[PDB]
Write a protein that binds this ligand. Structure first.
Ligand SMILES: Nc1nc2c(ncn2[C@@H]2O[C@H](COP(=O)(O)OP(=O)(O)O)[C@@H](O)[C@H]2O)c(=O)[nH]1
Ligand SMILES: C/C=C(\C)CC/C=C(\C)CC/C=C(\C)CCC=C(C)C
Ligand SMILES: C/C=C(\C)CC/C=C(\C)CC/C=C(\C)CCC=C(C)C
Ligand SMILES: [Mg+2]
Lengths: 194, 442
């Protein structure tokens, strides 16, 4: 139940690319074909072991707010890392990454870590975004790149682990200490506290 | 393809609308929530410093001048309309039941101060402070104590704890008389505890005053210091949080989406939908703020001046508090209404390091609104910049039953959000036909 560091992660990207399925595959190890949920995923908590350190990840999902690009600015508050997802079968979803990058520049801290994920790599016949083009783009925008499949699990754990490592290894000691369990008391009030 | 049909359309993302949208989504309703504006929060949004210049200044300064004086825009989340949360108020109750606490963090406000004869005094938040305060002499304090002991001991259920008083049949002045309280004590209880902005309550049934005073005492009792909480990153976090609750439970959001046309059932004037650049959307009812249906609203006859002041130092005579309320009771200035100041700072992530935001407000009663605020400006010490706005207060002409157009009230001059949650509860009852019942989110 105790942990070394706690990081806040976000998922972002166009509707339909598989963000919620990616999070459920990572958190619950489940995949539902033609996934549709009445109540959207809020966030999931998963503790991972990282170079002998216990890292608690609170990973936030969009609750569908991306559909018409209405992500609440509060979504980015206190984020350490952001995973930008597109769909390898959908060129527009890839083109949309440039816009999400601009949003991240606007609302997230200048030091936030970013990762590019091309999801649905199981759909080999329907791929249209070429790996080398996506990789060169990720390079040009300061982020690593993985292609994943929530459906068959390809690279899913590795995507979240890649991000947790980008953060833990990039962070100044001041920033890293503030994520420790001892430093979890931020001086805020617990409204559910008697 | 976008679904045409919804249970409810909501217009504007002010906090009243966002709470309703969240509650109705939680109830299982299919909600479409649209704003003409390119951001959340409606009239009670928190905005950046550049936006503050755009809104309230004639010639906005350059990015370079702004940043050299005030730092980065990202550090600034400035409330357009000041409000605190009562710690035991209804908004806290809603936050806890819906778990919107997951999306918004809160800090205590350091204290509430009352103005008397040119000086400010911290209103007691504990027994030691009550013993210490020069606001009352010893014998008046003893009479005050018996009054507050009655507040604490009164059980509606049990007539033996009423001390011959009836909360519905007796006026608040008559309640004060039973305890022999003088005019200065009446002003203190009425304005600093019940938080009335005027003395109308003296000749009205005691019940609402009794409940407000109990609410104040329960709120200061929750965590000490003061009766108030304030959200980290500003009031704009609240509507954003309730919008997220709605989205989780199935709500659909559109911003920067003008309402081209409101649609009505022919020859009836009743709501059926809206036309937008994205298509035509239908629902049996709409919930909206006054800016979407100005013809269906009326002025309350009050205008509120709100002066957003940026300081580069703490407010004098507040023990360098990171946040506070100041109350200037009407009798101290020969006014008809109190003047409030709401002060927050870098401790609440609303401005860059070293700055304070002091937002002064009151209902205008003279022909020179800026001059009315002078006694409050004088309490602040040197002021770096002022951004001045005046808002007319609106309310719906009708309750919405006739036309299924359920409108909220403009955010009022009160210093906290209780009247806003009163409006939510009233609108919800109007919309659903039954009082709101909160369940604990699972
Ligand atoms: N073939 C395939 N389909 C997927 C994958 N991930 C998600 N989907 C499907 O893509 C659709 C959208 O998934 P969802 O998780 O809701 O995407 P979101 O809108 O980005 O959250 C659903 O029909 C999913 O079943 C994947 O890796 N491969
Ligand atoms: C249940 C907890 C108790 C009875 C102790 C806490 C006290 C409270 C909540 C009352 C605060 C009192 C005042 C604002 C009275 C003001 C007093 C003077 C101006 C002397
Ligand atoms: C739920 C809490 C309530 C209703 C507050 C009750 C508080 C009381 C009775 C304390 C009031 C104390 C004073 C006015 C200070 C008394 C001090 C002297 C007479 C020196
Ligand atoms: Mg999703």
């Amino acid at each position: 139940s105790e942990y070394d560091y706690l990081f806040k992660l976000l998922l972002i990207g166009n509707s339909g690319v598989g963000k919620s399925c990616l999070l459920l595959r990572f958190s619950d190890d489940t995949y539902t074909n033609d996934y549709i949920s009445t109540i959207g995923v809020d966030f999931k908590i998963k503790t991972v072991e990282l170079d002998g350190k216990t890292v608690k990840l609170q990973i936030w999902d969009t609750a569908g707010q991306e559909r018409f690009r209405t992500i609440t600015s509060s979504y980015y508050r206190g984020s350490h890392g952001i995973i930008i997802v597109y769909d390898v079968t959908d060129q527009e979803s890839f083109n949309g990454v440039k816009m999400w990058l601009q949003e991240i520049d606007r609302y997230a801290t200048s030091t936030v870590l970013k990762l590019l994920v091309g999801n649905k790599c199981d759909l080999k016949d329907k791929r249209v975004v070429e790996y080398d083009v996506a990789k060169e783009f990720a390079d040009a925008n300061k982020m690593p790149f993985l292609e994943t499949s929530a459906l068959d699990s390809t690279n899913v754990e590795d995507a979240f682990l890649t991000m947790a490592r980008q953060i833990k290894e990039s962070m100044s000691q001041q920033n890293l200490n503030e994520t420790t369990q001892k430093k979890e008391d931020k001086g805020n009030v617990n409204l559910k506290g008697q | 393809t976008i679904d045409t049909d919804y249970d409810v359309i909501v217009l504007g993302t002010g906090i009243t609308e966002c709470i309703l949208s969240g509650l109705l989504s939680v109830d299982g309703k299919k909600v479409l929530h649209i704003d003409k504006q390119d951001h959340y929060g409606g009239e009670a949004a928190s905005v950046t410093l550049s936006q503050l210049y755009e809104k309230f200044k004639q010639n906005p300064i350059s990015k370079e001048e702004r940043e050299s004086k005030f730092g980065k825009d990202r550090d600034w989340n400035v409330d357009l309309i000041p409000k605190f949360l009562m710690a035991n108020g209804e908004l806290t109750n809603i936050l806890i039941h819906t778990d919107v606490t997951r999306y918004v963090d809160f800090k205590q406000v350091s204290g509430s101060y009352v103005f008397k004869q040119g000086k400010i005094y911290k209103v007691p938040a504990n027994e030691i402070e009550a013993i210490s305060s020069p606001l009352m002499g010893i014998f008046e304090k003893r009479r005050m104590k018996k009054f507050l002991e009655w507040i604490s001991s009164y059980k509606e259920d049990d007539l033996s704890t009423h001390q011959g008083l009836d909360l519905d049949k007796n006026t608040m002045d008559e309640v004060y008389y039973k305890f022999g309280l003088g005019n200065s004590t009446k002003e203190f209880i009425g304005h600093a505890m019940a938080l009335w902005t005027n003395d109308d309550y003296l000749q009205q049934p005691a019940r609402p005053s009794f409940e407000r005073i109990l609410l104040y005492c329960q709120s200061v009792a929750r965590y000490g210091k003061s009766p108030y909480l304030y959200p980290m990153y500003g009031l704009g976090e609240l509507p954003q949080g309730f919008a997220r609750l709605s989205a989780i439970y199935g709500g659909t959001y559109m911003l920067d989406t003008p309402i081209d046309e409101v649609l009505y059932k022919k020859d009836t004037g009743k709501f059926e939908g809206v036309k937008t650049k994205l298509g035509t959307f239908k629902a049996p009812l709409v919930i909206a703020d006054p800016t979407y249906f100005p013809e269906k609203c009326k002025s309350t006859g009050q205008r509120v001046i709100r002066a957003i002041c940026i300081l580069n130092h703490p407010v004098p005579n507040t023990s360098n508090a990171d946040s506070l309320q100041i109350i200037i009771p009407q009798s101290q200035l020969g006014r008809k209404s109190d003047i409030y100041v709401a002060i927050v700072s870098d401790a609440h992530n609303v401005c860059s390091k070293g700055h304070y935001l002091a937002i002064i407000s009151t209902i205008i009663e003279t022909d020179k609104p800026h001059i009315e605020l002078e006694p409050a400006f004088k309490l602040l010490g040197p002021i770096e910049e002022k951004f001045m706005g005046i808002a007319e207060l609106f309310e719906p002409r009708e309750d919405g039953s006739k036309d299924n157009i359920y409108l909220s009230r403009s955010y009022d001059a009160s210093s906290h959000f209780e009247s806003m949650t009163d409006d939510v509860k009233d609108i919800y009852f109007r919309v659903t036909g039954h009082p709101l019942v909160l369940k604990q989110r699972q």
